[PDB]
Curated annotation (Swiss-Prot):
Matching PANTHER family: KALLIKREIN-6, KALLIKREIN-RELATED
Protein's name in the database: Kallikrein-6
Lineage: Eukaryota, Metazoa, Chordata, Craniata, Vertebrata
Catalytic machinery residues: 41 (charge relay system), 85 (charge relay system), 176 (charge relay system)
Activity regulation remarks: Inhibited by a range of serine protease inhibitors including soybean trypsin inhibitor, benzamidine and serpins. Activated by a range of glycosaminoglycans including chondroitin sulfate, dermatan sulfate, heparan sulfate and heparin.
Organism from which the protein derives: Homo sapiens (Human)
């Protein structure tokens, strides 16, 4: 995440870190004791899920690890256009909850008006390096019209744009699958955007979570 700062230690209990081959690959969101929601492009064999993490370079009393027993990629995910970039990961065992490990509810109403939101993750920072401490930044939802104007013919109904016209705070490589949180509910998942990262001109594009309430419910229940 670029142009943000370190998160408060107790502000992201729903954040998951997804690892493969010993390195962080993506973020994710705990939405139920047995399920982590993330981006479909984060699919890899042998994913490892870590909950309760804050600083990747420090063993933390709150961290918990879990293997994935099943990965459900949206049936219509398209890896070129990024359409329907969403995937559910079933954990081997339900997560043990605490102040540092908690699920985040989903925003079910696509018309919700809480436009001030925040993003978080261990993805690339402004200096081009990957941080040990998870980063946080507040950004604002952008109207679909402006989204379409920035990426003509590339934005689908399954995508939501968000950015910061002041400093260009934005998600980046490694933040993929992480949460776009608005009004204490999950509004989106980090999907794609400008490269190099920065949202002043081109906003970040997030999977429009409100569109998947039915699919997620059916998959989990
Ligand atoms: Mg298709």
């Amino acid at each position: 995440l670029v142009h943000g700062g370190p998160c408060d230690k107790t502000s992201h209990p729903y954040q998951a870190a997804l690892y493969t081959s010993g390195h962080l690959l993506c973020g994710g969101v705990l939405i139920h004791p047995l399920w982590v929601l993330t981006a479909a492009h984060c699919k890899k064999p042998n994913l490892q899920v870590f909950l309760g993490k804050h600083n990747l370079r420090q063993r933390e009393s709150s961290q918990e690890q879990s293997s994935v027993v099943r990965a459900v990629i949206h049936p219509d995910y398209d890896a070129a256009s990024h359409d329907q970039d969403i995937m559910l990961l079933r954990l081997a065992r339900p997560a043990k909850l605490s102040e540092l490990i908690q699920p985040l509810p989903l925003e079910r109403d696509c018309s919700a008006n809480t436009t001030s939101c925040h993003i978080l993750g261990w993805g690339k920072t402004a200096d081009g390096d990957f941080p040990d401490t998870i980063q946080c930044a507040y950004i604002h939802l952008v109207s679909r019209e402006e989204c379409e104007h920035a990426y003509p013919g590339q934005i689908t109904q399954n995508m939501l744009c968000a950015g910061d016209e002041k400093y260009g705070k934005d998600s980046c490589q490694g933040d993929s699958g992480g949460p776009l949180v608005c009004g204490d509910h999950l509004r989106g998942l980090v999907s794609w955007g400008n490269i190099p990262c920065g949202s002043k001109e081109k906003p970040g594009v997030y999977t429009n979570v409100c569109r998947y309430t039915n699919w997620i419910q059916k998959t989990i229940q």
